[PDB]
């Protein structure tokens, strides 16, 4: 009992009930999603650091993340991704 580590285990497992309520997923398959989601998180945030740097600003807010995912994700992925985030911020600011 030591080294409590951080993984996205329950979250990917719980969100998968959206598309297939009953299908399971392998424990090794848990790690690839752990590696994939973590990988994309690095690249989006890593991009955001530069855009704030270019304009010489000290805060990361919705706008630059909005353009960050508009650069990194090609095609129509961003369009719904903008849509998903747009709903995401509205719910938070409505219940603030």
């Amino acid at each position: 009992r030591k080294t409590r580590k951080e993984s996205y285990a329950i979250y990917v497992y719980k969100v998968l009930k959206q598309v297939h309520p009953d299908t399971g997923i392998s424990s090794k398959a848990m790690s690839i999603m752990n590696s994939f989601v973590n990988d994309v998180f690095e690249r989006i945030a890593g991009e955001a650091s530069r855009l704030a740097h270019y304009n010489k600003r000290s805060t990361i807010t919705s706008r630059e993340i909005q353009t960050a995912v508009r650069l990194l994700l090609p095609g129509e992925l961003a369009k719904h991704a903008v849509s998903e985030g747009t709903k995401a911020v509205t719910k938070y600011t409505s219940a603030k």
């Binding site: 951080e6 969100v15 090794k28 998180f41 890593g46 000290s58 709903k87 938070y92 600011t93």
Partner: protein, 108 residues
């Protein structure tokens, strides 16, 4: 008062609670906005949804019910935009999509 998470507040699943603290140590800027992790958390929800939705779609064709790590390769390399996002990306125990060149086939 009463303790309730921000994920329920913003009506999504991915951890706006953890993304905040992790992004604070992430060394990306001096400050991170309150709305920064919420807007981000949807994008992980969106990306995880389609990848697993296609992972779920591939599984039903192979009659299996557990998502084999192979199934991801057989789903990621069929959506050109998702392929483009992971074009230079290899996945362990992945195999490759089935394909054979036209000329290599028998003449008749």
């Amino acid at each position: 008062a009463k303790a309730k998470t921000r994920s329920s507040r913003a009506g999504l699943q991915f951890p706006v609670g953890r993304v905040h603290r992790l992004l604070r140590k992430g060394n990306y800027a001096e400050r991170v906005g309150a709305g920064a992790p919420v807007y981000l958390a949807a994008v992980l929800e969106y990306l995880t949804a389609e990848i697993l939705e296609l992972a779920g779609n591939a599984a039903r064709d192979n009659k299996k019910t557990r998502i084999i790590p192979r199934h991801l390769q057989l789903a990621v390399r069929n959506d050109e935009e998702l392929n483009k996002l992971l074009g230079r990306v290899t996945i362990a125990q992945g195999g490759v999509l089935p394909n054979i060149q036209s000329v290599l086939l028998p003449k008749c």
